[PDB]
Design a protein around this nucleic acid. Structure first.
Ligand SMILES: O=c1ccn([C@H]2C[C@H](O)[C@@H](COP(=O)(O)NP(=O)(O)OP(=O)(O)O)O2)c(=O)[nH]1
Ligand SMILES: [Cl-]
Ligand SMILES: [Cl-]
Ligand SMILES: [Mg+2]
Ligand SMILES: [Mg+2]
Ligand code: NA
Ligand code: NA
Length: 326
DNA sequence: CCGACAACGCATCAGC
DNA sequence: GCTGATGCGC
DNA sequence: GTCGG
């Protein structure tokens, strides 16, 4: 965090292009730069020094110069002023509300926490639940609490079928001191890239996780992807823990490594590794890594048996989870 | 220059 | 209902 | 917004 001010400045600009400008590339551009500049082991002295890192070009170099000189960026002061942009940015914090729905609500005249609460009838299931736990979701989860949640999720899963193997991924597997949510990868010998010898494999787990009042709400639920809410149980006369976001992703057991790699992130690390895979000539997803022929079309899955195998295919030295946080 | 930028599950809606 | 585009969050 | 052919 030698450059917290700059990386923070960049993130804001990224969120602005995303939520307000709906310019998804300008968004990612800024994120990448914020990232590269965040791993940079030196306290940037000037824009020039930054334009050396890949991801920081001219435009971002100048802003960093403007920020180092005055401790701020005029382009952001302005945005912070513009009322329409400020509303859109705030509405985009309610889970389930993207740039489109925000700008939409603003037009309808809904632009504050209050407006949303008196118009609950205009929110879909996801947005509704998101507003419900607006505050809670703003809070981070301490690793200590992540460990507790992990026991529950794993012991319960073991309860449904000792065949289930549940791995907590995300910022947790990358060993963070806190997480924005909990991400769980689930496998079961019955479900492979070859056959689903059992249905409701995911359903079963969510059902058990709901019986013990661990899962409290649902944002979306598919045959292999659950997006919901959970809560650590409290003791007598003990203030309740905040409600937490939990993702559950069921992946074919023979494709675990590609799946664990994906769900371990970071999202930027994946975006980079997948970009680099495409240059090396391959394509990677949470399922498999396939080669690319001249036609461009993806080939057949390559034999993977370790996260490291994927790294090799693309000629990238293996990086530990902790070193994938970008 | 200028085309590309990671990849995909689930919810919601339009058009048939 | 089904397919495909768009939205939203991984 | 940045970058590699
Ligand atoms: O756009 C995305 C988002 C997420 N992911 C992967 C990486 C990420 O770590 C994982 C789970 O997503 P989260 O939103 O949970 N991010 P992460 O757990 O890394 O951080 P946080 O602590 O915010 O949850 O999914 C992508 O590949 N692309
Ligand atoms: Cl600023
Ligand atoms: Cl695939
Ligand atoms: Mg997470
Ligand atoms: Mg998540
Ligand atoms: Na650069
Ligand atoms: Na949002």
């Amino acid at each position: 965090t030698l450059n917290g001010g700059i990386t923070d400045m960049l993130t804001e600009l990224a969120n602005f292009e995303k939520n307000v400008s709906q310019a998804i590339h300008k968004y990612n551009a800024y994120r990448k730069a914020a990232s590269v500049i965040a791993k940079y082991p030196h306290k940037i002295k000037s824009g020039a020094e930054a334009k050396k890192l890949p991801g920081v070009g001219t435009k971002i170099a100048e802003k960093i110069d403007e920020f180092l000189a005055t401790g701020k960026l005029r382009k952001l002061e302005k945005i912070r002023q513009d009322d329409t942009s400020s509303s859109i940015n705030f509405l985009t914090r309610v889970s389930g509300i993207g740039p489109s729905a925000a700008r939409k609500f603003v037009d309808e005249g809904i632009k504050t926490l209050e407006d949303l609460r008196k118009n609950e009838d205009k929110l879909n299931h996801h947005q509704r639940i998101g507003l419900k736990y607006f505050g809670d979701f703003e809070k981070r989860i301490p690793r200590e609490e992540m460990l507790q949640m992990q026991d529950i999720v794993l012991n319960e899963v073991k309860k449904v079928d000792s065949e289930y193997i549940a791995t907590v991924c995300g910022s947790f597997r990358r060993g963070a001191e806190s997480s924005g949510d909990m991400d769980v990868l689930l496998t079961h010998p019955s479900f492979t890239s070859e056959s689903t010898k059992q249905p409701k494999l995911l359903h079963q787990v969510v059902e058990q996780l709901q019986k013990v009042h661990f899962i409290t709400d649902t944002l979306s639920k598919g045959e292999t992807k659950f997006m919901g809410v959970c809560q650590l149980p409290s003791k007598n006369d003990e203030k309740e823990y905040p409600h937490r976001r939990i993702d559950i992703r069921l992946i074919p057991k023979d494709q675990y490594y590609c799946g664990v790699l994906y769900f371990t992130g970071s999202d930027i690390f994946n975006k980079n590794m997948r970009a680099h895979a495409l240059e090396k000539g391959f394509t990677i997803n949470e399922y498999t890594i396939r080669p690319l022929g001249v036609t461009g079309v993806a080939g057949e899955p390559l034999p993977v048996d370790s996260e490291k195998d994927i790294f090799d295919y693309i000629q990238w030295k293996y990086r530990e989870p902790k070193d994938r946080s970008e």
